[PDB]
Design a protein around this ligand. Structure first.
Ligand SMILES: [Cl-]
Ligand SMILES: [Cl-]
Ligand SMILES: [Cl-]
Ligand SMILES: [Cl-]
Ligand SMILES: [Cl-]
Ligand SMILES: [Cl-]
Ligand SMILES: [Cl-]
Ligand SMILES: [Cl-]
Ligand SMILES: [Cl-]
Ligand SMILES: [Cl-]
Ligand code: NA
Length: 129
């Protein structure tokens, strides 16, 4: 599913991401924009052999099982394919664990490089939320 911007903001908000670990909703929308272009089916191989999955590009080295990432863990206790669903529940539950791991949203390199410190409120402008 390719979410619209406000459509994703509303779903993330409903799932409790707004101000989760202190990160406002626009941070999460910005991260999803640059991680997946709001496409739940996005997948991208990393150089280490892991793969990132779904709207928030959650990686298989630590967070989900894809059966092809040697030495990796599955700390969200889910198959990585569950992160590609139209329904973002699994991705959000897993993202909550990631952003709690110690470095906050810096875990998403694209957030650090493209969203951190910017006017992230713009990502929720116009939305009836
Ligand atoms: Cl915001
Ligand atoms: Cl881009
Ligand atoms: Cl894909
Ligand atoms: Cl992989
Ligand atoms: Cl995801
Ligand atoms: Cl594996
Ligand atoms: Cl393969
Ligand atoms: Cl393994
Ligand atoms: Cl999803
Ligand atoms: Cl933080
Ligand atoms: Na894994």
């Amino acid at each position: 599913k390719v979410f619209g911007r406000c459509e994703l903001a509303a779903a993330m908000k409903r799932h409790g991401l707004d101000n989760y670990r202190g990160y406002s909703l626009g941070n999460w929308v910005c991260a999803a924009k640059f991680e997946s272009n709001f496409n739940t089916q996005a997948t991208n191989r990393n150089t280490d052999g892991s793969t990132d999955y779904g709207i928030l590009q959650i990686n298989s080295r630590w967070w989900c099982n894809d059966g092809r990432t040697p030495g990796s863990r599955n700390l969200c206790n889910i198959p990585c394919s569950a992160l590609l669903s139209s329904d973002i529940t699994a991705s959000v539950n897993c993202a909550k664990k990631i952003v709690s791991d110690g470095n906050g949203m810096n875990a998403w390199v694209a957030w650090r490089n493209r969203c951190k410190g910017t006017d992230v409120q713009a990502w929720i402008r116009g939305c009836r939320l």
